[PDB]
Amino acid sequence: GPLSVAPEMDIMDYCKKEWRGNTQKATCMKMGYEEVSQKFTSIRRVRGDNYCALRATLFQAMSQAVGLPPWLQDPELMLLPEKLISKYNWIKQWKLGLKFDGKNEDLVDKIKESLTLLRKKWAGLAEMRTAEARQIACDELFTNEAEEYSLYEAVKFLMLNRAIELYNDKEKGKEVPFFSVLLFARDTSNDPGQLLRNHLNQVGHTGGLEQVEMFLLAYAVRHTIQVYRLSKYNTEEFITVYPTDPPKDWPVVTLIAEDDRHYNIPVRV
Ligand SMILES: [Ca+2]
Ligand SMILES: [Cl-]
Numbered sequence: 001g002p003l004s005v006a007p008e009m010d011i012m013d014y015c016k017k018e019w020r021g022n023t024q025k026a027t028c029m030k031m032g033y034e035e036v037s038q039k040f041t042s043i044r045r046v047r048g049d050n051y052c053a054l055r056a057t058l059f060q061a062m063s064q065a066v067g068l069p070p071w072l073q074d075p076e077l078m079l080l081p082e083k084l085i086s087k088y089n090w091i092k093q094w095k096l097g098l099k100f101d102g103k104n105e106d107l108v109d110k111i112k113e114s115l116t117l118l119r120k121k122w123a124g125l126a127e128m129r130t131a132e133a134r135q136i137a138c139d140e141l142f143t144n145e146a147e148e149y150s151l152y153e154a155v156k157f158l159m160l161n162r163a164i165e166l167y168n169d170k171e172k173g174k175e176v177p178f179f180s181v182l183l184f185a186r187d188t189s190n191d192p193g194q195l196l197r198n199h200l201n202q203v204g205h206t207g208g209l210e211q212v213e214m215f216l217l218a219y220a221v222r223h224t225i226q227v228y229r230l231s232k233y234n235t236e237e238f239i240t241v242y243p244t245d246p247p248k249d250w251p252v253v254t255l256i257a258e259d260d261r262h263y264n265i266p267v268r269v
Contacts, residue, residue: 001144005059006045008267011036014043029258032230035238036256040266047144048262050202053209053217054152055142056263060253061223063138065125069251071222072119080161081111088164090193095201097156098149114154117147149204156200158220159213164192166219177243179215186212208261218242224252228266231259 015033019026046056071077085091085108092107100110121141128134142148166180184190188198203209209217218225225242232238255263 003139004047004055004142004144004148005139005265008042008044011040011043011266014045028233029230032228032233032238032256032258035233036228036266040254040268042267043256044265044267046262046264049204050206050208051149051152051204052261053214053263054155054203055148056255056265057217057221057223057225057253058151058155059138059142060255060265061221061251062122062125062141063135064251064253065122065134068119068123068126069222072122077115077119078112081108081115081157084161084164085111088192091160091196093193093197093201095205097153097204098146111153111157114150115157117150118154121147121151152204155217155220156203159216160192160196160200162220163195163216167192177215177219179212179243183212183216211260214242218246218250222247222250224250226252226254227263228254228256230257 011033015030019029019033044059046052046059049055094107094111096107096110100113104110104113125134125137128137141151163180163183166176167184169176170180170184183195189195199210199213203213214225214227224246227240227242229237229240232240254266256266257263
């Protein structure tokens, strides 16, 4: 299919096209792009569907991949679908986001296939000897075909796993990050099953990640997500980093968000 992350263009040309006229919002948005443009020259427009936040984050993480992170090296990752679904039968209420090949007879098989794909593609990008080869390959992967959407199934599953872990830690009285307190405080998300039924199952289908779920995404893929929040320009939230205090060895991916549903990718040479 066509690219789901558009070819790059100059960021101020993008701004000039998008934000015309004299409203206060238009002026704020221009100031916001001017801020971004101090560090990045170009922008790639990420498809604005209900996967937008996942697409933006994953595209940029994968396009920057020069290694395979430990969490993807871990043999346990491939074992997780069986362990979790066997333990927590309610995970079978999972809403699939593509049609899987018929070799895949159950949910465990489907999720395992998606995690295997994520691992294989990431490993292959990390092995590439030129940055150019890696962007060619990454581009090809985000072409609106089943492979692309299977990556999001993997990432959503990792988000669910991390949320289960954080919930169970809180239940054992262990220290957890505060974002997880806020995640579970939502009246539609009081436990992991509610998170799945009312939030994760909607992601890619009827809505995108909420603010609090960007923390969960960052934790799930162990990337620090640095977001220029252009709707927050004249406040301290003009950038928000998810999470605030990550391990120093998590890679950083930078995004731009005019609002919470739409993330684009700033780029530079
Ligand atoms: Ca190129
Ligand atoms: Cl024009």
